Amino acid sequence: APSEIVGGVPVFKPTYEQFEDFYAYCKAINKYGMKSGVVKVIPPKEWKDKLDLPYSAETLQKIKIKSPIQQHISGNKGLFMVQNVEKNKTYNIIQWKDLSKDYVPPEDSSFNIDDFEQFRTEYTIDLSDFQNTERLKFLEEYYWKTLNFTTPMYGADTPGSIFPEGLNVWNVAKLPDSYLYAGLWKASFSWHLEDQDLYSINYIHFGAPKQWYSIPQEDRFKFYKFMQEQFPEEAKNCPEFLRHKMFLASPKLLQENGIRCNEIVHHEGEFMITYPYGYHAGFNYGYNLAESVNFALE
Ligand SMILES: O=C(O)CCC(=O)C(=O)O
Ligand code: NI
């Protein structure tokens, strides 16, 4: 199996025949993902058909977004650090979709099983705006400029799954323990490797795309050292401080420091796979719901 294209990041678009087996397809593809930080995998149609949309009323209901996170991001130019502070509230998908009305991208009581049944036509967001490359570019530029002006909110690490219970192909929830990611515009994930240096799949079920950045394994030593130049204090005692604190570095910056930085856009109905020793970070282009798990190939 070869890659179909590159955005700096390999893009694989296999037939259902090869995509069929998750551990075989990941075993045959590991060499590419072990060079670049991440890898995109666009699934065949025979896969999509296996999905049940719109999600049943109950499914849309089981979605609980507990302890939302608000991020105060402090920094000047390409160098920022976030401090997560939790809200004790918990949201449902409808409240979340509503909440996203306060987190708009720049231009240029009690609920009932009936409410979610009504919501089966209202759960998605318009996407004819994220097709424009210049639009995405514009947003990303605004994102980095205005990082420290607003505090974004992220419904991250919320246990659950909206994959079909009987889906036995590439089902994040059940692999041979998954979490949902309720995204809002400007919600960010800082630079990091996975716990115990595992892999991870990330599939967007619906909503706005994500911006991804990764460090080619080759340059992870340059990267780690540079991030020591910066944030000298945080680096002092702690050897694994990138796993401790939340730092944000822009590609443009890293690039102009000898550090290669991959970048790609992650759309709904697509998988991102991160690999051991592949640093990654980014943000969400708006309201969305994703699902992910850490895993190993041995
Ligand atoms: O979706 C996120 O918030 C961060 C990305 C991530 O943790 C992953 O899927 O590996
Ligand atoms: Ni990750």
Q: What is the CATH number of the domain that holds 243?
A: 2.60.120.650
3-state class (DSSP) for residue 188: strand
Dihedral Cα 161, 162, 168, 169, nearest 10 deg: -100
Elucidation technique = X-ray
What is the residue range of 95's domain? 9-298
Cα–Cα separations (whole angstroms), residue 78 to 133, 141, 176, 221, 254 = 22, 11, 40, 19, 8
| Residue 290 CA, closest ligand 1 atom number | 1
Q: Ligand 2 centroid vs 200 CA: distance in angstroms?
A: 7
H or E element that contains 45 = helix 45-48
Substitution site in 246, 270, 273, 292 for ligand 1 pocket (most atoms within 8 Å of beta carbon):
292
In a domain, 198, yes or no: yes
Is residue 131 domain-resident? yes
- Could you tell me if residue 103 is inside a domain? yes
How open is the CA angle 277-282-287, to the nearest 5 degrees? 135
The rounded distance, in Å, linking the Cα atoms of 30 and 199 is 10
Ligand 1 neighbour 200 (Cβ under 6 A): yes
The total of structural domains in the chain comes to 1
Using the mean position of ligand 1's atoms as its centre, give its distance from the Cα of residue 203 in Å: 9
Q: How far is the CA of 280 from the centre of ligand 2 (A)?
A: 7
Of all protein residues, whose CA lies closest to atom 5 belonging to ligand 1?
A: 189
